[PDB]
RNA sequence: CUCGGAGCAGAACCCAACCUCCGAGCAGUACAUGCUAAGACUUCACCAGUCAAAGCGAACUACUAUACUCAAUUGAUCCAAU
RNA sequence: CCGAGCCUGGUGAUAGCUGGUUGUCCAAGAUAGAAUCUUAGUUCAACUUUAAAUUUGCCCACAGAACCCUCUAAAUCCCCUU
């Protein structure tokens, strides 16, 4: 109110702003220190003789000859194989509900890794051995939303909070290559490469995704009901029947395990300049992008 | 230490620190005890008990180990089922 | 950034509440961030100095200092130590009062 | 739509139909509607939250008659003046887990009372001096001279 | 520094694979002790299998 | 040339000399000298070293037993053997 | 100037060693020790400097801190008040 105009009506009487009368904000440019004069000249802060003044100090970690500290400690595999471990950026239910209340993520359509990135909900670093997001249980009590979310990992309590409100949660695997394409599709459509089919999870991760308790995308659909009922009895909530809901057709929607996006089969070449999609007809190519 | 490499022009990491120490995101460094596998037949159970314990390092040590490593080893990681996940953050710490 | 959709009941499950309409007729004004949250942040330097910052302050910023010193003194038992920057329109306070100030600024409808 | 060899229909051909994983089975040990649940902060700063569960024991008809009598003796210290059985739990932050613990205590009460366990379990150390105290309180007891 | 005693390795007879090292006099028969085996959580017989070093 | 006790250094701690004296580089008994864990001392740094309630599990109704006697009675990292 | 020639180059060789290190003004500021092919050096600690946070710091009253033993020492440690 007053302060805004006070700084502009006071500028009307002052001289014109020009390249001469400019200055930096005080406190933003420290004075430079030069080895000149009585105070900073002579020895110039280096001391008297030794290796100190001559600039020949030993390397960092050298303790004068006795076995250094970083060498007399034994070796242990704290970081053995750190570059081959899988990482998952956590997504809390508080964060998800916060993104939904602001319109940055719409619950009317299926929520996947792409929609989260497009809404700045998460930041995936595939080059840093990231394999996706893990749905954590923080904020489960206040969470109130009916969504169809796909997350690479999910805890038993986070699932119950989403299945209590009438939603569906599924766990799917994206390899490092597909994970970079799902997060940033546009930079991939500028490479003129056909959409590749994502690979299956390694041997060690097949049990996780072939199990219904984890809502796996390669699990038997006939075992989900019994598993959905267990959490209801355990955590004391009445399992709702989504078949009656109007959004049921959207909740069931799931992508083929060999699929990357929704409605875009592997093998096609998106042409953004002309807004067209190219499909191969070769009998051999079709069999490669379908198996 | 190599402050400026001859090919990339950037600081290098001392790999003798990575094979012995673990850094928690908070800034703490964890190590083993020197001699937890040497001459256990002449040592007491009490001494052997505190020899196989993972202990912390001090300010002077941790400041050195941070200079001997690059920023890649100070980032926040989200490993799956990490045994040290709860130790990467301090609680009820003042001053 | 999309504008937040209208909701029937406020505050939302996440606790977000839209600004009051019309704006309060006060000497100052604190506008929301581009993400539609209150601009109250926690800052720390030297590992031991805890501060709180109020950004995006328009109008007379010295009246806001008086209102804050009158609202935080009971909680502390003494006048808080603050810093005013007329240039940047920012209020800096010694101590963590993040959640306490966010709610106090919502009652006014900022 | 798109189909691949690894599709669910192909992998599990005996589970066709979209409405195959969302069918609530119709074939119920604890009914929630017959339970009174409360949530309240504990010692609040204490991080954990408290979830109280209470329900009238006698009126409740979803428990076997003999079990109710067997439960009103063992867990008689958890019953109030009105007759309700109270079960608290504050071992977690999330109201979900705290309620799950209370519900599982009920399933454990209905099993102990139905198992009819009469095995000679180990005696507690705190109860060993009361056994001596009671034993020595019986030898001080006397009989009337002329009964 | 005459090596009067030696360090031996006592192996459990329960098949758990648990073993411990003890000190015994050189001029003496192989030991058969009754040590605690943490695997089975009770005392079990042990027997000298092989010598480690000469004390 | 490392380690321990005494004097110098009389009374908390600390204190040197190619100063004055005596010693150590083991042995013996156990075979729960098993596991775990609050709180503390510390040879003036670090490394190393030291004492420990409660608890699990044992033992036990006698053994000043529940961290053996003993002053020092000793050797980091890499590596090798397994 | 042959205990092994000269020239160029690698080469701005290396030097814990000596020497040198360029305007004004103000301010704070003298340091137990350990390890080290280490004592002409270095690293840790200690002292010293700057910024920040917080609450105690210095001086010190009684009471209290060992027998064995030759100087039955000057003193110290601990410590509210002030
Ligand atoms: K000077
Ligand atoms: K000078
Ligand atoms: K000279
Ligand atoms: K030197
Ligand atoms: Mg000089
Ligand atoms: Mg010198
Ligand atoms: Mg900051
Ligand atoms: Mg010390
Ligand atoms: Mg004990
Ligand atoms: Mg030179
Ligand atoms: Mg001065
Ligand atoms: Mg040497
Ligand atoms: Mg020196
Ligand atoms: Mg005092």
DSSP state letters, chain D: ----TT-HHHH-TTS-SSTTSS-------S-GGG-EEEEEES------EEEEEEEETTT--SS-HHHHHHHHHHTGGGB-SSSEEEE---SBSSHHHHHHHHHHHHHHHHHHHHH-----PPPPSTTHHHHHHHHHHHSS----S--
Question: Which residues lie below 8 Å from residue A35, measured CB to CB, with a gap of 6+?
Answer: A41, A44, A45
Most B CBs within 10 Å, among A63, A70, A135, to test the B interface: A70
Cα–Cα distance for residue pair E41/A124, rounded to 1 Å: 49
| C1’ F80 / CA B50, Å | 27
Judged by DSSP in three states, A156 sits in helix
Contact call for residues D6 and A255 (beta carbons, < 8 A): no
User: Comparing C-alpha atoms, which of A85, A84, A179 is closest to residue A126?
Assistant: A179
Identify all chain E residues contacting B41, using CB atoms and an 8 Å cutoff.
7, 21, 23
Q: Across the interface, do B20 and A76 touch by the CB < 8 Å criterion?
A: yes
Contact A124, A91 (CB under 8 A): no
Burial class, A170, CB count within 10 angstroms (exposed 0-12 / middle 13-18 / buried 19+): buried
The C-alpha atoms of residue B33 and residue A76 are separated, in whole angstroms, by: 10
Q: Chain A: give the shortest CA distance to residue C29, in Å.
A: 8
A28 touches strand F (CB under 7 A): no
Calpha distance C56→C73 (Å, rounded): 23
Helix or strand run (H / E) with residue C84: strand C82-85
Q: How far apart are CA E11 and CA E35, in angstroms?
A: 10
- 3-state SS class at A86: coil
Core vs surface per residue A133-161: b (16+ CB within 10 A) or e:
bbbbbbbbbebebbbbbbbbbbbebbbbb
Instruction: Give the C-alpha distances (Å, rounded to integers) separating A188 from A153, A185, A260, A279, A281.
Output: 25, 5, 12, 17, 22
Resolution, angstroms, 1 dp? 2.6
Q: How far apart (Å, rounded) are the C-alpha atoms in residues C57 and A144?
A: 34
Which residues on chain A are in Cβ contact (under 8 Å) with B80? 85-88, 134, 153
Q: Which sign, positive or negative, has the C-alpha torsion A240, A241, A244, A249?
A: positive
CA triplet A251, A253, A257: central angle to 5 degrees? Answer: 130
Contact, D48 vs D42, CB < 8 A?
Answer: yes
Distance of CA E41 to the CA centre of its chain: 18
* Among the listed residues A196, A202, A225, A199, the one whose alpha carbon sits nearest the alpha carbon of residue A213: A225
What's the CA–C1' distance between B67 and G65, in Å? 48
Q: How far apart are CA B18 and CA A70, in angstroms?
A: 10
Q: Which tokens in the block code for residue A146?
A: 């009916």
- In order, the DSSP letters of B13-81 are --HHHHTT-EE-TTS-EEE--TTTTS-GGGS-HHHHHHHSS-EE--HHHHHHHHHTS-GGGGS---BTT
In whole angstroms, give the CA distance from residue A3 to residue A42.
Answer: 52
Q: Which residues pair with A148 in a beta bridge?
A: A168
Taking the Cβ of residue A123 and every Cβ of chain B, the question of whether any pair is shorter than 8 Å is answered with: no
Cα separation, C98 vs C42, whole angstroms: 6
d(CA A26, CA D61): 80
Output the CA angle A190-A194-A200, nearest 5 degrees.
120
Could you give the angle at which helices A156-164 and D95-115 cross, rounded to 10 degrees? 100
Q: Which residues of A touch D24 (CB under 8 A)?
A: 225, 229, 239, 241
Q: How far apart are CA A227 and CA A220, in angstroms?
A: 11
CATH of D29-115, one of 3.40.50.1100, 3.30.920.30, 3.40.50.2000, 3.30.160.20: 3.30.160.20
Q: Is D16 exposed, middle or buried (0-12, 13-18, 19+ CB in 10 A)?
A: exposed
Buried/exposed E21-31: b ≥16 CB within 10 Å, e otherwise: eeebeeeeeee
**Distance in Å, CA D38 to ligand 8 centroid:** 55
Q: How many CA atoms lie within 13 A of B14 on its CB side?
A: 19
If phi > 0 it is left, if psi is from -120 to 50 it is alpha, else beta; for residue A212 that is: alpha
Q: What is the CA radius of gyration of chain A?
A: 30
Quick check: A1 and C58 CB within 8 A? yes
d(CA E24, CA A30): 75
Residue D103: how many CB atoms within 10 A of its CB?
23
Q: Which of A140, A119, A125, A143 is nearest to A88 (CA)?
A: A125
Which of C5, D96, C97 lies closest to A139 in space, CA to CA?
D96
Tell me which residue has tokens 């649940």.
Answer: D37
Query: Does at least one atom of strand F sit less than 7 Å from the CB of B18?
Result: no
- Are A97 and C13 in contact by the 8 Å Cβ rule? The answer is yes
DSSP E9-30: EEEESSSS--EEEEEEESSSPP
- C-alpha A32/C-alpha A45 separation (Å) is 15
Give the C-alpha separation, A128 to A89, whole Å.
11
Beta bridge partners of A111: A149
Solving technique: cryo-EM
Residue C30's H or E segment, with its range, is strand C28-30
Query: Which residue matches tokens 């098949």?
Result: E15
Residues 6+ apart with CB under 8 A from E14: E37, E39, E40, E44
For residue E53, the cross-strand partners are E7
Please give the distance of CA A231 from its chain centroid, rounded to a whole number. Answer: 28
Q: Where exactly are the structural domains of chain A?
A: 84-291
Q: Closest nucleotide to residue A66 (Cα to C1')?
A: G36
Identify the H or E element spanning A100. Answer: helix A93-101
Protein-contacted positions of strand F (CB under 7 Å): 25-37, 45-52, 57-58, 67-68, 74-79
Q: What is the spatial distance between Cα C68 and Cα C76, in angstroms, rounded to a whole number?
A: 12
To 5 degrees, how large is the angle CA A145–CA A150–CA A151?
A: 105
Taken in order C3, C4, C6, C11, the sign of the CA dihedral is negative
Distance CA D38, CA B2 (A): 63
- Helix (H) / strand (E) element for A170: namely strand A168-170
Element (H, E) at A161: helix A156-164
Q: How far is the CA of A43 from the centre of ligand 4 (A)?
A: 21
E24: left (phi over 0), alpha (psi -120 to 50) or beta: beta
Q: Does residue B64 lie within 7 Å of nucleic acid chain F, judged by its CB?
A: no
How far is Cα of residue A230 from the mean position of the Cα atoms in its chain?
31
Per CB-CB distance under 8 Å, the chain B contacts of A87 are 77-80
For the stretch A210-216, contacts whose Cβ atoms lie closer than 8 Å and that sit 24 or more positions apart, written own/partner, are A213/A156, A214/A154, A214/A171, A215/A154, A215/A159, A215/A169, A215/A170, A215/A171, A216/A170, A216/A171
> Do A97 and A145 form a contact (C-beta atoms < 8 A)?
yes
Q: Degrees (nearest 5) of the Cα angle C76, C80, C84?
A: 155
- The answer to whether A162 faces chain C, any CB pair under 8 Å, is no
Paired tokens of A13: 């009487």
Domain segments of chain E as ranges = 4-55
Nearest alpha carbon to residue B18 among A248, A82, A121, A67 = A82
DSSP helix/strand/coil, E8: strand
* Sheet order of strands, C82-85 included: C40-45, C49-54, C90-94, C82-85
CATH number at residue C43: 3.30.780.10
Q: Establish how many alpha carbons lie within 13 A of residue A93's alpha carbon, considering only the half-sphere containing its beta carbon.
A: 25
C40 near C56, Cβ under 8 Å? no
Q: Residue C67: in which H helix or E strand, if any?
A: helix C61-76
C-alpha distance from C106 to closest chain A C-alpha (Å):
17
What is the rounded CA–CA span in Å between residue A158 and residue A147?
13
Measured in residues, chain D has a length of 147
CA–CA separation, A99 vs A116, rounded Å? 9
Determine which of A26, A102, A118, A147 to mutate to test the interface with C (most C C-beta atoms within 10 Å): A102
**Residues across chain B:** 95
- The first and second tokens of residue A232, run together, are 């209801």
Q: Is E16 on the interface with B (CB under 8 A)?
A: no
Strand partners, E35: E44
CA distances from A252 to A50, A170, B75, D17 (A): 77, 10, 38, 11
- Using DSSP, state whether A127 is helix, strand or coil: helix
Q: What span, in angstroms and rounded, lies between the C-alpha atoms of D50 and D87?
A: 10
Nearest Cα to A134, choosing from A115, A109, A159, A105? A159
- Written as one string, the DSSP assignment of C13-26 is TT---PPPSS----
- The answer to whether the Cβ–Cβ distance between C35 and A4 falls below 8 Å is no
Q: Which nucleotide is nearest to E31 (CA to C1')?
A: F31
Which segments within A54-152 are labelled E, that is strand? 87-91, 130-135, 148-150
Residue pointed to by tokens 């709860």: B86
Tokens at A264, concatenated: 């875009």
E4-55: CATH, from 3.40.630.30, 2.20.28.120, 3.20.20.140, 1.10.1040.10: 2.20.28.120
Put simply, the answer to whether A218 touches D18 (Cβ < 8 Å) is no
| Chains sharing 3 or more CB pairs under 8 A with chain A | B, C, D
- Alpha-carbon distance D26 to B80, whole Å? 38
CB D96, CB A161: distance < 8 Å: yes
Count of helices and strands (H, E) across chain C: 2, 6
* Total number of domains in chain C: 1
Q: Residue D1 and residue C98: Cα distance in Å, rounded?
A: 51
* Residue ranges near strand G (C-beta within 7 Å): A 34-39, 41-44, 46, 49-54, 56-58, 62-66; B 59-60, 64, 95; C 45-46, 48-49, 94-95
Distance from CA of B37 to the nearest CA of A (A): 9
A87 and B CB contact within 8 Å: yes
Tell me which residue has tokens 């003789």. A49
Query: What letter does residue A121 receive in the DSSP assignment?
Result: S
List of chain C residues whose C-beta atoms are within 8 Å of the C-beta of residue A97: 12-14
Best CA proximity match to D62, nearest among D85, D25, D28, D36: D28
What span, in angstroms and rounded, lies between the C-alpha atoms of A82 and A77? Answer: 10
Could you tell me if A89 lies within 8 Å of chain B, comparing CB atoms? yes
Q: Is the Cβ atom of A70 within 7 Å of strand F at any atom?
A: no
Distance, C-alpha A192 to centroid of its chain: 25
Task: Give, for E53, the enclosing helix (H) or strand (E).
Answer: strand E42-54
- List CB contacts of C40: < 8 A, sequence separation 6 or more: C52, C53, C54, C98, C101, C102, C105
Report the alpha-carbon distance of residue D86 to residue A22 in Å, rounded: 75
d(CA A221, CA D21): 5
DSSP characters over A227-281 = HHHHHHHHHT-----GGGSTTHHHHH----TT-SSSS--TT-EEETTTTEEE---
Contacts of residue D40, Cβ cutoff 8 Å, sequence gap at least 6: D49, D50, D52
For residues A268, A269, A275, A276, the Cα torsion angle rounded to the nearest 10 degrees is -50
Q: Which residue has the tokens 């970079």?
A: A180
Q: What angle do CA B87, B89, B95 make, to 5 degrees?
A: 120
Q: In sequence order, what are the beta bridge partners of E45?
A: E34
- Kindly report the number of other CB atoms within 10 A of residue A23's CB atom: 6
CA nearest neighbour of D99 among A287, A118, C107, A233: A233
Q: Check whether the bond before C96 is cis (ω within 30° of 0).
A: no
DSSP 8-state code for residue C105? H
């Amino acid at each position: 109110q007053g302060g805004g105009a006070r700084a502009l009506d006071l500028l009307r009487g002052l001289p014109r702003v020009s390249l001469a009368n400019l200055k930096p904000n005080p406190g933003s440019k420290k004075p430079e220190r030069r080895p000149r004069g009585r105070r900073r000249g002579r020895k110039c802060g280096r001391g008297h003789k030794g290796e100190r003044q001559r600039g020949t100090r030993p390397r960092l970690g050298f303790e004068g000859g006795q076995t250094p500290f970083y060498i007399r400690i034994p070796k242990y595999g704290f970081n053995e194989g750190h570059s081959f471990r899988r990482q998952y950026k956590p997504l809390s239910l508080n964060r998800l509900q916060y993104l939904i209340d602001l319109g940055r993520v719409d619950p009317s359509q299926p929520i996947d890794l792409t929609q989260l990135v497009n809404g700045r909900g998460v930041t995936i670093q595939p080059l840093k051995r990231d394999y996706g997001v893990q749905l954590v249980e923080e904020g489960a009590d206040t969470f109130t939303a009916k969504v169809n979310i796909e997350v690479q990992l999910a805890s038993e309590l986070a699932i119950a909070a989403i299945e209590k409100n009438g939603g569906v949660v599924t766990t799917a695997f994206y390899d490092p290559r597909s994970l970079d394409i799902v997060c940033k599709p546009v930079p991939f459509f500028l490479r003129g490469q056909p959409i590749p089919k994502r690979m299956l999870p390694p041997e060690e991760l097949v049990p996780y995704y072939t199990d219904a308790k984890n809502r796996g995308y390669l699990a038997d659909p006939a075992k989900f009901p019994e598993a959905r009922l267990e959490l209801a009895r355990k955590y004391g909530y009445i399992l709702p029947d989504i078949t009656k809901d109007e959004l049921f057709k959207m909740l069931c929607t799931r992508k083929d395990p060999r699929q990357i996006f929704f409605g875009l089969a592997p093998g096609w070449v998106v042409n953004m300049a002309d807004k067209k999609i190219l499909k191969p007809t070769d009998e051999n190519l079709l069999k490669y992008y379908t198996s | 230490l190599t402050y400026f490499s001859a090919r990339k022009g950037k600081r290098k990491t001392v790999k003798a620190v990575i094979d012995r120490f673990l850094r928690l995101h908070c800034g703490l460094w964890v190590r083993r005890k020197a001699g937890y596998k040497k001459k256990l037949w002449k040592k007491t159970p009490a001494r052997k008990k505190r020899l196989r314990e993972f202990v912390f390092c001090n300010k002077t040590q941790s400041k050195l180990l941070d200079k001997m490593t690059t920023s890649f080893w100070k980032r926040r990681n989200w490993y799956v089922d990490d045994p040290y996940q709860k130790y990467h953050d301090r609680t009820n710490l003042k001053v | 950034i999309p504008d937040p959709p209208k909701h029937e009941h406020y505050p939302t499950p996440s606790g977000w509440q839209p600004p009051r309409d019309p704006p309060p007729n006060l000497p100052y004004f604190v506008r929301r961030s581009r993400m539609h949250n209150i601009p109250v942040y926690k800052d720390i330097t030297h590992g031991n100095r805890q501060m709180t910052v109020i950004r995006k302050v328009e109008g007379d910023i010295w009246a806001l200092q008086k209102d804050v010193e009158d609202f935080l003194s009971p909680l502390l038992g003494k006048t808080p130590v603050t810093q005013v920057n007329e240039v940047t329109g920012t209020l800096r306070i010694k101590g963590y009062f993040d959640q306490e100030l966010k709610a106090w600024l919502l009652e006014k409808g900022f | 739509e798109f189909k691949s060899i690894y599709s669910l229909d192909k992998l599990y051909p005996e589970s066709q139909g979209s409405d195959t994983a969302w069918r609530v089975p119709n074939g119920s040990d604890i009914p929630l509607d017959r339970l009174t649940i409360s949530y309240c902060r504990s010692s609040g700063n204490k991080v954990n939250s408290k979830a109280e569960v209470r329900f009238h024991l006698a009126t409740a008809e979803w428990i076997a008659e003999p079990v109710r009598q067997k439960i009103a003796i063992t867990h008689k210290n958890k019953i109030n003046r009105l007759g309700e059985l109270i079960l608290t739990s504050e071992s977690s932050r999330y109201q979900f887990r705290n309620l799950a613990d209370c519900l599982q205590k009920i399933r454990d009460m209905i099993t102990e009372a139905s198992q009819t366990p009469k095995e000679p379990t180990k005696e507690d150390v705190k109860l060993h001096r009361i056994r001596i105290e009671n034993m020595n309180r019986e030898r001080l007891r006397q009989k009337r001279i002329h009964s | 520094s005459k090596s009067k005693n030696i360090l031996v390795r006592m192996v459990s007879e329960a098949g758990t694979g648990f073993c411990f090292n003890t000190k015994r006099n050189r001029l003496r028969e192989k030991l058969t002790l009754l040590h605690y085996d943490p695997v089975v959580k009770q005392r079990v017989l042990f027997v000298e299998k092989k010598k480690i070093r000469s004390l």
